[PDB]
């Protein structure tokens, strides 16, 4: 975005810089280990309240 002004004139050179830098990492683990003991011909249970 450049402009020109024919009515004024700046003194010297100015640079006015600005820097920004960012880095990031993440790591989520979630583990489950379930046992159930049961029988061969096991049926469901109907309680359900």
């Amino acid at each position: 975005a450049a402009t020109f002004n024919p009515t004024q004139s700046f003194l010297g050179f100015n640079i006015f810089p600005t820097l920004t830098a960012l880095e990031t990492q993440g790591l989520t683990r979630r583990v489950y280990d379930g046992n159930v003991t049961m029988q061969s011909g096991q049926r469901s249970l109907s309680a359900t309240g």
């Binding site: 029988q39 061969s40 011909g41 049926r43």
Partner: peptide, 29 residues
């Protein structure tokens, strides 16, 4: 008629009950 079939879920047993000809048909299936 047709042969009687009895299925047991606990033991996974199939029981066929009928005339000897109707029972040999299920036995080959």
């Amino acid at each position: 008629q047709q042969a009687t079939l009895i299925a047991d879920k606990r033991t996974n047993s199939l029981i066929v009950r009928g005339t000897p000809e109707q029972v040999a048909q299920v036995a080959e299936l």
